[PDB]
Amino acid sequence: MNAWLQLNTASEPMLLIPSQALIDTGSEQRVITVDADGRFVPKRVAVFQASQ
Amino acid sequence: AEQIEEVARTVPGVASALAERLEGGRYINVEINREKAARYGMTVADVQLF
Numbered sequence: 001m002n003a004w005l006q007l008n009t010a011s012e013p014m015l016l017i018p019s020q021a022l023i024d025t026g027s028e029q030r031v032i033t034v035d036a037d038g039r040f041v042p043k044r045v046a047v048f049q050a051s052q
Numbered sequence: 053a054e055q056i057e058e059v060a061r062t063v064p065g066v067a068s069a070l071a072e073r074l075e076g077g078r079y080i081n082v083e084i085n086r087e088k089a090a091r092y093g094m095t096v097a098d099v100q101l102f
Contacts, residue, residue: 025078026078026079
């Protein structure tokens with residue numbers, strides 16, 4: 001019989017954001033941060049990995 | 053076009069000014085490695101089908 005094996009594995013703890021939140025232009029990755037006043041200020045981030 | 057774009061919006065009667073960029077496109081490149089693929093007996097064309 002065929003049988004599909006689904007696995008889950010936890011990585012080390014890292015900062016977690018949704019994927020649609022990350023912009024990657026291949027030379028830099030950034031997110032758009034929302035300030036205290038509601039101002040939208042961009043910030044550079046370093047990506048570790050992603051999944052699901 | 054980018055400079056000309058922003059000066060255009062300083063002009064008294066302009067409501068909107070946007071210049072279409074020529075390389076604002078985003079790519080996901082699959083840079084195939086002939087040597088690596090060859091190891092599995094695959095040609096560039098073979099890998100590309102995927």
